[PDB]
Design a protein around this nucleic acid. Sequence first.
RNA 1: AGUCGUAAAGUGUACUGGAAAGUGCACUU
RNA 2: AAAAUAGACUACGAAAGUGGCUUUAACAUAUCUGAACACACAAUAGCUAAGACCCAAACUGGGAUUAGAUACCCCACUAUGCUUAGCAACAGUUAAAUCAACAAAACUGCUCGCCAGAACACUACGAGCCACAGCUUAAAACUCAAA
Lengths: 263, 67, 319
Amino acid sequence: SRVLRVVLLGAPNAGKSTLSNQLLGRKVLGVITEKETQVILLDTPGIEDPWKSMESADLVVVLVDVSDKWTRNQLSPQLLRCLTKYSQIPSVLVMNKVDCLKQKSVLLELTAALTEGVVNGKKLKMRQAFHPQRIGWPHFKEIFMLSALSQEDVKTLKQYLLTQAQPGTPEEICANIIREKLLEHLPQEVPYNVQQKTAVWEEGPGGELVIQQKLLVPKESYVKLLIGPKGHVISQIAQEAGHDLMDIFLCDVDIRLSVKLLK
Amino acid sequence: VDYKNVQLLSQFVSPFTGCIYGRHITGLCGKKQKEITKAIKRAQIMGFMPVTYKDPAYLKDPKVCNI
Amino acid sequence: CRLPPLPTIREIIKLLRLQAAKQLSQNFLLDLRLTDKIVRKAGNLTNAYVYEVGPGPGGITRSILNADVAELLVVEKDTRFIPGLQMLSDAAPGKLRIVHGDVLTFKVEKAFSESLKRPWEDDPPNVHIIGNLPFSVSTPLIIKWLENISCRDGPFVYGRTQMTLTFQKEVAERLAANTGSKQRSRLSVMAQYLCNVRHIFTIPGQAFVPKPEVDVGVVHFTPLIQPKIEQPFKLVEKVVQNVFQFRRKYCHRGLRMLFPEAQRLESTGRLLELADIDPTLRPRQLSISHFKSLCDVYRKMCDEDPQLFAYNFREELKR
RNA sequence: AGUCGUAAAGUGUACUGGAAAGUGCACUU
RNA sequence: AAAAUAGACUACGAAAGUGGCUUUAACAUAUCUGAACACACAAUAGCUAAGACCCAAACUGGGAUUAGAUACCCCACUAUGCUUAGCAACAGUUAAAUCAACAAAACUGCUCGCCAGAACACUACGAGCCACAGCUUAAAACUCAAA
Ligand SMILES: [Mg+2]
Ligand SMILES: [Mg+2]
Ligand SMILES: [Mg+2]
Ligand SMILES: [Mg+2]
Ligand SMILES: [Mg+2]
């Protein structure tokens, strides 16, 4: 039996949660068991929790968003401190959201900047033209270039991680799905200010799951945004939410969404 | 509609939560909806009807609600 | 005297390595003409010793050096500007003396020679301070320097050194507020019983290259030969703070909190009656003479009651 | 003026002594 | 203490406002317009007295943080949030070219109030408070061909 504790570090919106979900194969600490290997992924908040996770880490996966022009050119100082104090733990660089890059050859230069020209103890000599606060981390064991959103080559990282292993409520679910749909469809802060209240949850005469959920908001403009033109917006949400539920509980579900102002 | 007729008033509440149904579910004209609402509250506060659930003795009465 | 051209905002973004203009978290006055105006309002600087704080890009530095100063002591916190200030020093040899450190802890009292020290009652001692600092740093600085004037130490070991500092327009108005004005507050009294304070002019926010949503006032301080209250600084500070904590209520509502609850009623009345403060005076209607009276009587009350001066009514409300 | 330089968000009000504006209370989309 | 469901209801009340249950009182007026000055209410500021203080909280302290830290996080506690007592209408028309535009389709009749350039301009001769140096409080002239 082989086990590997891997901790995900990086910027807030570097996609750590997305990559963890893709590795797990489900949108959810996570455990990936395959044959005789067990990989424990520890998702940490973006930059006390990351350091405490490092205290029990066998491998570190440093995610960098290449699409973000502001932060792609350097590793954040706190991340560099984290790696320096735990230099003994192996670290692997993952350049996420490559699909968003228009000119992807840029990646190459970024590597030289992020790895300081050294990877896995070997220098990255590169044909050289015609003749202090650290910016990178020269002790990365390996480099990956992937896009977690499209699952592009996440399988390669999964197989790599498997290789480095060393011998050794339903109402809540429905609320989470509705929250996801609200986030996807509603603008700005509105989906963060919607309170949900389960009104009816029962089994109908035909074996279906009859759900009536109430969407409470503090403002009338939020009600208008929720209902949308001619009731389209809310309607769309319900159907999509219902469709997701079709796959989660494996039955027929009649979900009805009603919007009321918080008094 | 009488507050003592708990059997009839239980035909208009949720079996699992005891919440009162609306006219879109019950199908009553608004006046009888008001009578049923007031009767249910009167029975609940006078110790005739449960509030957080439907009395199990009346779970097998005819279903007149469109839910 | 030929000096290097002023850096434009492009070179400044390149120098701070931000690569964009909406991430400075700082506003620079890159108009040598307004800085000429400020240095003009600072007085006649010919052969003067100027302690310039918050140099930054160096518009104020260039303006001051354009005036025939003798020594210009510069104190910069950031090291990305020291290269530019070194180029400035080389362009004007012998006049610019650059130092790295915080202005809140830097010791100006040893900076200049001891041949410049004039007596307190004589004229201002040819040593000036000019400052365009972040407003998050100029208020603690002016409080510290007001304490120094009260103690006649620090930058005022040379005598009555004159100061020219930039504050926010509201803060500058409050520093230079008169009795009864809507801007009369703690800062007004604290500055005014120790200094002659003058709000000269206001620079609109549109004149600063990243334009702030506020205006900027320039205020000149000259220490007073005779302070209007001869008490320790912390005592006056306590009295003023307790008077102004309730700005819209009668002055006694704020003055009762200097005393423990047990003796609050009688002690407050004794304070007011041994002073001659009419208790219907609201805090903005108190002149520095009313505060002198209150401070004298309160010093007495503390001197015949040791425990009083350390009393904090919130530490008694905790229990 | 050049015989100068350069490329969630708001509205009020109150306080503001770490005010290049912040916080508190009430409102608007 | 404040009232999930009903309420996808739109009722009651002059307005502000009123949606837990029971009971008792109880919801003016048989034409309309007509109040600064009459009587009832109602709301909005700002201060004054006392009182309560769970909770929250401008200010005020304390703790942690970059390399002008987080203005922004945490703790404590004030004012305050609380409780008293005080300081266009009405009736009829849709026929006409409806129709400066923009809003909100235009109309009549009948009555009350209000309106005759910028200008609800600016200004402190002065007055009150203060008590030598500051605060609060104005109309008119005057000017212009605009606004
Ligand atoms: Mg503040
Ligand atoms: Mg505000
Ligand atoms: Mg009448
Ligand atoms: Mg508290
Ligand atoms: Mg009338």
